[PDB]
Amino acid sequence: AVGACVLCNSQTSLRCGACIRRPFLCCKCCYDHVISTSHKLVLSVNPYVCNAPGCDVTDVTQLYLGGMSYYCKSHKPPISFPLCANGQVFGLYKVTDFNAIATCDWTNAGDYILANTCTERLKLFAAETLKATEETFKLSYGIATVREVLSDRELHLSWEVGKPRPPLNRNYVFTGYQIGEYTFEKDAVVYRGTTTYKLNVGDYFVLTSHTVMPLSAPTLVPQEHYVRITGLYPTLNISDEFSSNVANYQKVGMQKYSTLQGPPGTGKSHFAIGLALYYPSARIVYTACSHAAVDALCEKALKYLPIDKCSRIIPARARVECFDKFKVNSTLEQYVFCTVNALPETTADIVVFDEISMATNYDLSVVNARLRAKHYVYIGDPAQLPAPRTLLTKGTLEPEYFNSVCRLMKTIGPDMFLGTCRRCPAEIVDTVSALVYDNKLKAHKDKSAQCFKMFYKGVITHDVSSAINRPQIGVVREFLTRNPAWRKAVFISPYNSQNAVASKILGLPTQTVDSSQGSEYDYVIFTQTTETAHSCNVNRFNVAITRAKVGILCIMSDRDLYDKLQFTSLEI
Numbered sequence: 091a092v093g094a095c096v097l098c099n100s101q102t103s104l105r106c107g108a109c110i111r112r113p114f115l116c117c118k119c120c121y122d123h124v125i126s127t128s129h130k131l132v133l134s135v136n137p138y139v140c141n142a143p144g145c146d147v148t149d150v151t152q153l154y155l156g157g158m159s160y161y162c163k164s165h166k167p168p169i170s171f172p173l174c175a176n177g178q179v180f181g182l183y184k185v186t187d188f189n190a191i192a193t194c195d196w197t198n199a200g201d202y203i204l205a206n207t208c209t210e211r212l213k214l215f216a217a218e219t220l221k222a223t224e225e226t227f228k229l230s231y232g233i234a235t236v237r238e239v240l241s242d243r244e245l246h247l248s249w250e251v252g253k254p255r256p257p258l259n260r261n262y263v264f265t266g267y268q269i270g271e272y273t274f275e276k277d278a279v280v281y282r283g284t285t286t287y288k289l290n291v292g293d294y295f296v297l298t299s300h301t302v303m304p305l306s307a308p309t310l311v312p313q314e315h316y317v318r319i320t321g322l323y324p325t326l327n328i329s330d331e332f333s334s335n336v337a338n339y340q341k342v343g344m345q346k347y348s349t350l351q352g353p354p355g356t357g358k359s360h361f362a363i364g365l366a367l368y369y370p371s372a373r374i375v376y377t378a379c380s381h382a383a384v385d386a387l388c389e390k391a392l393k394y395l396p397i398d399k400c401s402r403i404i405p406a407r408a409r410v411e412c413f414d415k416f417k418v419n420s421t422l423e424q425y426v427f428c429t430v431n432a433l434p435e436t437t438a439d440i441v442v443f444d445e446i447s448m449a450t451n452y453d454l455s456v457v458n459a460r461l462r463a464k465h466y467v468y469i470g471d472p473a474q475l476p477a478p479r480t481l482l483t484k485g486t487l488e489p490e491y492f493n494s495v496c497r498l499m500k501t502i503g504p505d506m507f508l509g510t511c512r513r514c515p516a517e518i519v520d521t522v523s524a525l526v527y528d529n530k531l532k533a534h535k536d537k538s539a540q541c542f543k544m545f546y547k548g549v550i551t552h553d554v555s556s557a558i559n560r561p562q563i564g565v566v567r568e569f570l571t572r573n574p575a576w577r578k579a580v581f582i583s584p585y586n587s588q589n590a591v592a593s594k595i596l597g598l599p600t601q602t603v604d605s606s607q608g609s610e611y612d613y614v615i616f617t618q619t620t621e622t623a624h625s626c627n628v629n630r631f632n633v634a635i636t637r638a639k640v641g642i643l644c645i646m647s648d649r650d651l652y653d654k655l656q657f658t659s660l661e662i
């Protein structure tokens with residue numbers, strides 16, 4: 091019970107008992123917390139509770155020090171000092187933002203705004219408090235017990251009465267019972283086991299509530315600027331393929347950390363793999379939150395870097411399928427590709443963290459605690475999608491509040507910016523450039539003349555709260571008959587339920603906007619489905635239309651985003 095104050099570092103025995111993380115608070119700060127919040131239980135070697143037998147006084151403001159013990163107003167001896175006096179709580183070794191982080195329920199956007207504008211130690215307190223609140227919230231939903239098994243990919247469930255029913259999308263991963271993780275999609279439901287098993291009737295599923303570990307390392311280490319490239323040895327013979335990034339690779343070697351903003355198809359993976367060809371002796375650990383993002387870095391590495399010095403780190407509890415062409419779990423190979431939660435304790439000359447909009451401050455801190463590096467590179471785009479905030483229901487989280495790195499890219503600007511989109515037809519580049527990049531994103535491709543927009547509100551139906559628009563899928567069906575080249579298109583929408591209906595009526599491969607991020611397809615068919623804050627989000631809109639290499643068909647619901655689309659309008 092001897093720790094350091096989360097607000098001023100002053101050595102103390104005091105920890106708040108009403109805080110779910112029980113942070114160490116100094117005498118001066120513990121006071122300004124207990125007197126300003128409903129938090130009155132103070133902890134030390136022993137709790138600050140009335141020592142008198144059968145007495146339930148636990149409020150620190152209703153307690154005193156009677157010699158060496160603690161008592162309330164009704165049990166204190168004559169020679170007793172109040173615990174709360176002169177702006178201090180009695181302790182050994184003798185706040186507005188801390189109070190709000192300590193007592194908030196994390197359902198409001200202003201909670202996440204504060205969690206990112208506060209001091210660095212408050213960002214860590216905010217990050218483990220939030221994560222602990224998110225885990226304890228999982229204990230609230232109901233158990234799904236199997237009622238009947240139809241086939242290898244379909245079943246019927248019986249839900250627990252009196253406890254809510256969680257959203258049945260791939261975002262929510264149940265743990266079967268210990269018969270492996272299982273995912274679900276829409277009374278005939280579709281079941282997806284990570285481990286192949288002949289689903290037993292009566293066997294039950296539950297949401298795994300992993301333990302939240304305390305955070306030690308900052309989200310961002312303190313910045314260092316150098317006068318020359320430090321600990322890295324560049325090549326003079328660097329292929330013309332990577333010549334565009336030489337000046338940026340040098341910036342990478344002359345700073346402790348650097349930020350790269352890369353709009354869709356501007357060459358982020360190329361920059362990341364090319365950083366290894368520029369510092370060919372450097373050991374580089376490549377990391378991201380998702381397995382898909384780590385796999386996208388493995389694909390680009392497999393093309394330019396020696397396959398023998400590569401290794402894809404897979405956690406022992408292997409959940410879903412990932413990259414199979416590197417030696418698995420060889421921690422000491424020069425190039426290590428691994429997700430943030432699976433990172434071993436190691437050092438590196440460079441750490442590359444990709445898809446930075448998807449990271450939380452918890453992930454930012456974890457990377458700094460597991461990896462000790464000469465240089466850190468954060469690659470991503472704050473105009474793309476962030477990590478889902480399951481508790482957040484009121485308000486919209488702006489990009490400068492996604493994490494510390496995103497806050498930096500939006501306020502002081504990114505250190506590096508890839509300005510030429512090589513993927514998209516100019517119609518798409520011109521739309522997103524004006525929408526989210528302040529007209530700074532340039533088109534390498536010409537206009538494809540295969541980008542269409544239709545304004546069709548249709549009819550909105552709902553599977554629980556996930557939306558469907560059958561008339562918008564009907565409009566797509568009529569379009570496909572007159573445009574058979576579009577037979578090879580990927581159907582994208584902001585809702586899983588819309589995607590489930592489109593898969594059966596159109597037969598096209600389906601993808602949510604959130605699961606499409608990082609991927610590219612020749613043709614994309616997007617139905618907006620609704621006019622909600624979710625389907626109108628400019629980051630989601632940006633990701634949705636920047637997936638296409640050749641053409642896109644956008645069936646819009648919102649007049650605003652329809653009018654901004656620089657596409658050929660269609661009739662019906």
Ligand SMILES: CNc1ccccc1S(C)(=O)=O
Pocket residue numbers: 652653654655656657658659
């Ligand atoms: C018909 N749409 C279109 C075409 C070319 C350039 C700009 C637009 S707009 C005004 O909708 O942004």
Ligand SMILES: [Zn+2]
Pocket residue numbers: 106107108109123129192
């Ligand atoms: Zn507290």
Ligand SMILES: [Zn+2]
Pocket residue numbers: 095096097098099100115116117118119120
């Ligand atoms: Zn303090």
Ligand SMILES: [Zn+2]
Pocket residue numbers: 140141142145146147161162163164165
């Ligand atoms: Zn008492």
